Structure 1
Amino acid sequence: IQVAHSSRLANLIDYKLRVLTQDGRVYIGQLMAFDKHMNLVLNECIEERVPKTQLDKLRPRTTLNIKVEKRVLGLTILRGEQILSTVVEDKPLLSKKERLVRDKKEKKQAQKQTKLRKEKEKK
């Protein structure tokens, strides 16, 4: 996958990030929020790790296969003190053109909502 060169973390919302952390763990989940302290909110994250036993297989000297422990965690929020790096993995479910259409439609619905709320409270 290829990510645009000028794309900060504010622009990668609904991508599927792969957040590394201070312990070797990795939280593969869909991003949907962040903060000044960089403490993300991952949607469907899967906290992986490489065990203490199979870590000898990564030690420098066919391929190498590592058996990791996928542990499903639904809608975590992270604490930003722990994060070490973020790597993008997968693109969103929607396109860019489809997100443009859906964003114009949401803003149109919000403006109709506030119009009806104002004209109802004036009546």
Structure 2
Amino acid sequence: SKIQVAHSSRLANLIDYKLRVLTQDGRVYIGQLMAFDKHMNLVLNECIEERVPKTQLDKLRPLNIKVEKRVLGLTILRGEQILSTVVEDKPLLSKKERLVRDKKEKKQAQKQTKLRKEKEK
């Protein structure tokens, strides 16, 4: 889908990407990751869960496929019953804009620590 996912990136670098994560059933969840852990428990913002019916599976066996989509919103999915994750869609704001946003967050956090040091005195 001409996204060109990064060639040397991991889960700390794939954050806030619109993932298309596959499970053991095939119940594909599409949404933005915002956190993970050692067991790969993924929170998913604006997530949608898509499946294929049993009648559509005969047409899928060797065209249009009518998938069943349900809307989950902000969910938190476990890492046991998942199989694979890919990157489907890029986020809204770019890498330089995320860098400027992270510098603003660091400056705001340093200002908050200076405010806590001023309130402690």
Q: TM-score range by the shorter chain?
A: over 0.9
Give deviations 1:46-97, integer Å, cap 9, x for gaps. 000000111001111xxx1110111000111111101100010111111011
Name stretches of at least 5 consecutive residues in structure 2 with no aligned partner.
Answer: none
**Deviation of the 1:44 alpha carbon:** 1.0
Q: What secondary structure, in the 3-state scheme, does the structure 2 residue paired with 1:57 have?
A: helix
Distance 2:12 2:106 in 1: 19
Distance 2:20 2:30 in 1: 4
Bigger fraction of residues in strand: 2
Q: What secondary structure, in the 3-state scheme, does the structure 2 residue paired with 1:23 have?
A: coil
Name stretches of at least 5 consecutive residues in structure 1 with no aligned partner.
Answer: none
**Deviation of the 1:26 alpha carbon:** 0.1
- Counterpart for residue 24 of structure 1: 26
Q: Percent identity?
A: 100
Q: What secondary structure, in the 3-state scheme, does the structure 2 residue paired with 1:33 have?
A: coil
Q: What secondary structure, in the 3-state scheme, does the structure 2 residue paired with 1:83 have?
A: coil
Larger radius of gyration: 1
Matched positions, count = 119
TM-score (normalised: structure 1): 0.94
Distance 2:76 2:46 in 1: 11
Counting only pairs closer than 5 Å after superposition, residues 18-57 of structure 1 correspond to structure 2 as 18-57=20-59
- 4+ residue segments displaced more than 4 Å: none
**Deviation of the 1:24 alpha carbon:** 1.4
Distance 1:16 1:82 in 2: 20
TM-score (normalised: structure 2): 0.95
Q: CA RMSD in A?
A: 0.8
Q: What secondary structure, in the 3-state scheme, does the structure 2 residue paired with 1:70 have?
A: strand
